[PDB]
């Protein structure tokens, strides 16, 4: 269940309300200000890292279940999503439908959106690829 969720359901959830568009209309006050803008923020693919912990001083390093248990740290990994920021503009001639056109400003990077707790012995955990000797080295019970 956890593997299915992490593999598919995260992307499915993010692919529902990915697009958020805010439209600033003409706001007719003078003939020199008649352009209407539309800002769009869209979410694409989602990436998940291995379990990691950031210390107080700001140093981040991979986290293992033994260290998490001993240090009272949450065994979790970071989630990243590609974000596309588009902006369209149109000439708002009175009494006519608008024709939004890209203004050659289409920014596009990974944004941190939180940490997802990772179930042990899962596809995203460090111990799934560990053998018996690896578990003994990592201080985990086979």
């Amino acid at each position: 269940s956890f593997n299915q969720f992490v593999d598919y359901t995260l992307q499915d959830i993010i692919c529902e309300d990915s697009t958020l568009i805010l439209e600033q209309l003409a706001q007719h006050t003078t003939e020199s200000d008649n352009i209407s803008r539309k800002y769009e923020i869209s979410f694409g693919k989602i990436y998940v890292t291995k379990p990691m912990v950031n210390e107080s001083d700001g140093v981040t390093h991979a986290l293992y279940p033994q260290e998490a248990r001993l240090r009272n740290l949450t065994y979790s990994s970071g989630l990243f999503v590609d974000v596309k920021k588009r902006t369209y503009e149109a000439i708002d001639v009175p009494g006519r439908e608008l024709k939004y056109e890209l203004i050659a400003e289409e920014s596009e990077g990974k944004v941190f959106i939180g940490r997802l707790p990772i179930m042990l012995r899962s596809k995203n955990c460090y111990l799934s690829e560990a053998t018996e000797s690896d578990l003994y080295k990592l201080k985990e019970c086979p």
Partner: peptide, 9 residues
């Protein structure tokens, strides 16, 4: 006048 800022779905 409108709210000059609105959400389109």
């Amino acid at each position: 006048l409108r709210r000059k800022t609105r959400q389109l779905k």
